[PDB]
Every structure is written in structure tokens, then in C-alpha cells.
Nucleic acid binder design. Sequence first.
DNA 1: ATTATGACGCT
DNA 2: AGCGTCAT
Length: 430
Amino acid sequence: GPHMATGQDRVVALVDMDCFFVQVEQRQNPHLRNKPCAVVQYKSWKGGGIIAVSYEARAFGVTRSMWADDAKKLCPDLLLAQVRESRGKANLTKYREASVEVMEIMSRFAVIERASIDEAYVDLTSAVQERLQKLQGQPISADLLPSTYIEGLPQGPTVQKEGMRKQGLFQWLDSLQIDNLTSPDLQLTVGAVIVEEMRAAIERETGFQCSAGISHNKVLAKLACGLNKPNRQTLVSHGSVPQLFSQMPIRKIRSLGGKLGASVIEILGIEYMGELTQFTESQLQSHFGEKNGSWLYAMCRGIEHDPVKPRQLPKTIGCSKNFPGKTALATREQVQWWLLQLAQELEERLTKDRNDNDRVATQLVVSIRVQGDKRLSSLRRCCALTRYDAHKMSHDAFTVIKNCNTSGIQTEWSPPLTMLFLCATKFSAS
DNA sequence: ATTATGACGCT
DNA sequence: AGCGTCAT
Ligand SMILES: Nc1nc2c(ncn2[C@H]2C[C@H](O)[C@@H](COP(=O)(O)OP(=O)(O)OP(=O)(O)O)O2)c(=O)[nH]1
Ligand SMILES: [Mn+2]
Ligand SMILES: [Mn+2]
Ligand SMILES: [Mn+2]
């Protein structure tokens, strides 16, 4: 009752750029705009691997992790842009630099947590309080929410998309308690006004469109963001959670799309998020551990406490390349040459990071995969990173891995390596 | 031959 | 520290 918490203390948004790498290439090359198009890495094997897909191309069934040749079977007029290749490997610098453009704009409105190259959480609680105090009580016009959906509305007692969106928004606004500066629904609504402004600024100043979710925590904001893509934002209120979760497959919630989610389904004999409410907190902890159990108990009621961390820069700067099938590395000269290539890209990126961001990495993590190993990484070892020098970094990586060569011959490398990965970590201010 | 990342939890 | 999971 009056003491049972409802997880409505914050306003959190998740902003995700639509088909980002595609939008970056479409900005650069206007011939690709408003077309079925995709971004690919490499080209020789099956046309290259697709990693991003415009919504026009998605309508034909084109997806990520599809070979370009197969995509062309679904969509013969598909247009393709290729990721840059430098030092023999894919180089993602163009997309990282575009990401910094967007993140710097977002940071003008609130402190952000960079969750990926293309998405960031926003803690809007304080900005909402500000705008409400500037809002001397007058209601929020629908004109301030021109791209907002209210999940679950319209309901109760026109056959167009935009008409439905507007009906739901009008039902929502009509029911608003605009006189109460502590009303969570009002706070979410003002958060959505701010996110409209942030998304408008991103598009005006970069050309890029995005989607967003507004709710009371990170998981609901992420889920909300996915409900109406592209170029739209969705408000998920606390009150919308019972209906939303009653038909929500457990795997759709962030962190439950893998083995843990499958075990929730198999152990409890349930399918949907809402079914979790019938278990006690102790029951869930008994199956899934104390941390997971408390998290699930709260999450299935719409409640989650993970903070938006004030972190707009990545914590690690890494370089990796797979050597699949017959391209696996089988000589010492080969291994050394590719370690050097990776280390030279790493040096370039680290030196730019030090100039931009006033910090230096201090640990080098070296990871490899050996042929026939099912795991992504067969081995991970760390060593000291004391100098931003590619030859030193590659020599050190070779020293940390050289005992994995089981070949008696010092010239050959066996079993051959199917992955190399260098990662700079443990930053200190400088 | 589903690639190049990046974050975080466990012990 | 080194490994596993999750995201995509
Ligand atoms: N190199 C590489 N990049 C990836 C991979 N998966 C995704 N990316 C990149 C390309 C995408 O444009 C970008 C953002 O990922 P998202 O899941 O947010 O999808 P995207 O923005 O493409 O589409 P959407 O958000 O659904 O509109 O990340 C991958 O496996 N390898
Ligand atoms: Mn995206
Ligand atoms: Mn994303
Ligand atoms: Mn995607």
C-alpha cells in the first residue's frame, strides 16, 4: 500500500540511432538516400557480411548477419556501402566519429551513458523538474509531442497510423494531472517533450534520425524505444506495464535474451514477463541466484534501479580480426604481421583518444581463438601498456601468446589461429 | 565463414 | 586475473 515502492522516482530515456551505419553512408552519398540499402564488411566471401540495413531493405527481409549475395536474392535492387579497409582489416573510424557528433549533442540536454556506438541512456529527472518549474502549471500541448506514441493507448469505447498515434496521445493528455509537480505520468510526459527537442537537435545538426523510449528506468526505456521505429519515440508509463508484459516474451527484456532467459522459461514453465509476478522473491532467488532473483522480482512489476552512469566515452579501445576457414594463421611471420597491423590501428586510435580526452590506457589485453575451439576466445592474457608504440605492443602481445604454439617447428604455428584481439584498458587521467 | 566491437558478472 | 554472458 502506502509503503510499497513503485519505481517511479526517475525519468530515463534511451535514444537509439536508426540503422546508424546506413545513415552515416547515406549522409555521405545522397544517391543512397531513401533506398533499400545496407552496409557490408569485406566482399570476397559471399559478397560480404551485412551489418546494418535501411528500413526500406528490411521490408524485403534483408537482415544483419546475412551475406550480401543472399540479400541480393531477396532484394535485387539493394544498394550496398562497404566499410573502409585499412591495414588489411575493417576500420570503423567513420562511424565512431559520427557517434561522437551525436553524443556531444545529447550531452547538452543531460548527462548520458554511452551504451553502444549508436545508443545512449539519458537521466532526465532533473531537467524534467526544471521544465516543470518553468511550466507554471499550464498543460502540455499535443503539438509539443509530434512524434510520440503512448504505449497502450488508445483503448476503450480512423484506420491510419498517424491517426491512431494522435488518438492515443489525446487520451493520454486528457487524463493528465498537470497541477501536481510530483505526478510520475506528468514527469514522463515532460521527459518526452525534452526528448522531442533532443531528437530535433540531433537531426538538425547531423542529418541523422533516431528513435527513443521514455520511462522510469533503463529496461523499460529500452523496450519502449523498440515499439515504434523508425523516427519515433514511445512513452511507457508505470500503469502500462501489466498489459504490456502480459504478452511480452521473456527474451525481449534486455539481459534475458540468452541462457538465463531460456532457463526462466524452462524452470518455471512460463512464456511471458507478466507471469513472473506469481513467484515470491525467495522463489526467484532460489532458482536464479540472489541478484538475478531480486532483479526479476522487481522487473516484472516495472521496477529497476540500475543507474544511468555518467560516461559518454568508451571504457576500452579494442582492435579485432577473425581468420576463418582456410585464412587461419599458420606461420610465425603471419601471426607477427597481423599483430602488427592490429597494433598499428590501436596506436592510431589511442593517440587520438589521448589528445581528445586527456587520458592514457595502462593495460593491454591480448585475446586469441585457436582452430576447433567453440568459444569466442580461447585465451585472454594481460600485460602492461606503458608506451603508445605499435611495435612494442605487438612484440608484447606475441610474448604473452607465444607459448600457445604447440608446433615443434619454431617457424610454423599450430593449431592455427582464427582470431586476434588487442584491447587497451584501465585508463588514467593525464 | 554470424564480424568487430563493447559492457559487465563470476570466482 | 582470466573466463563467461549478453548485446548486435
Ligand atoms: N562491426 C559490427 N557492427 C555491428 C554489428 N551489429 C551492429 N553493428 C553496428 C551497425 C549498426 O548500424 C550499429 C547500431 O546497431 P543497432 O542494433 O542499434 O542497429 P541499427 O542502428 O543498425 O538499426 P536499428 O537501431 O534497429 O534502427 O551497430 C556487428 O555485428 N559487427
Ligand atoms: Mn540503432
Ligand atoms: Mn543501438
Ligand atoms: Mn539493429
